[PDB]
C-alpha cells in the first residue's frame, strides 16, 4: 500500500492522464499532435 483517502464518494468510471510533448504546433490551434511514446498501459478489474 501507499496511501488511503477518505474521499467518501461513488466512482463508476475512470480515465488515464498521459503527459505529452508538443512535437509541432499549428496556427489557429486545431489540436496538433503530440509525442510521449507508445503509452503502453494495462487495465484490470478486481472481483471478490
Amino acid at each position, epitope marked *: 500500500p501507499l496511501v488511503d483517502l477518505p474521499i467518501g464518494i461513488n466512482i463508476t468510471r475512470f480515465q488515464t492522464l498521459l503527459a505529452l510533448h508538443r512535437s*509541432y*504546433l499549428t496556427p489557429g490551434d486545431s489540436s*496538433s499532435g503530440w509525442t510521449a511514446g507508445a503509452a503502453a498501459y494495462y487495465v484490470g478489474y478486481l472481483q471478490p
Partner: antibody
Amino acid sequence: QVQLVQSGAEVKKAGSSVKVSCKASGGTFSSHTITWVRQAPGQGLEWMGRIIPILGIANYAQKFQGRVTITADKSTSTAYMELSSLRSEDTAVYYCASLQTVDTAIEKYYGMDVWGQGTTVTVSS
Amino acid sequence: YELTQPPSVSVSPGQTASITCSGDKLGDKYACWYQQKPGQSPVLVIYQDNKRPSGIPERFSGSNSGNTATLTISGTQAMDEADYYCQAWDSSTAVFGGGTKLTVL
C-alpha cells in the same frame, strides 16, 4: 477558435483617461493568456504586458511601469485596462493576442497564435 | 537582451533570402519570428525554434546558432511583402526589434 474582436477607432482629447478592451466572443475566455502589444509607424512593436484570466497574475513591462492598470474578470468574459498620462508621441495602434497557455513558465513554449485587427487611437489637442 | 538588425533587405524574386537577427546571448532562448503584411494583422510563422507551424506553406526555414538566429526563405513570391520581427521570452518579458522590410524587384 477565437476572434478577439474589439471596438473601432475612438477620438478623444489629450490628457484624458484611455480605456480599451478586447472581447473574444469565440472560445472560452479563460485557458488562454491574453497579452497586448503596441504597433506604431516606423517604430517597431512595443510590449506592454500580459494578464492571465484564470490565474489573475499580470506582468508589467519596463517602460510601462505604473502607467497601466490591467484587470480581467471571468464573470464578464472581458479584459479591460486603464491608461493615463499619455502623450502625443505615445499615440500608436494597440493589438491584443492570445498565447494558448495559462502558466507563467510555459509562454516560451508557445507564440502569439492570434492577433486583433488593431484599434487606432487619435489624440486631439 | 538588446536587438539590433539591418533596417531593410532587398532580394530578387525566387531567390534564397537569409535574415540575421543579432543580439546578446539569444541562442538557446526560444526566439520567435513574426510576419506582418501591409493592411493585414501580424501572423505567427516561427515558434520556439525556427519552427514552421502546420498550415503555413513550407517556404520559411531557419536554425539557431550559438549567438545568432537565421531565417531562410524558399520559393519567394510577390505576395511575400511583409515585415519580420524577431523576439524572445527573456527574463519573463518580450522584446521586439526594429524589424526588416523585404523588397522584391
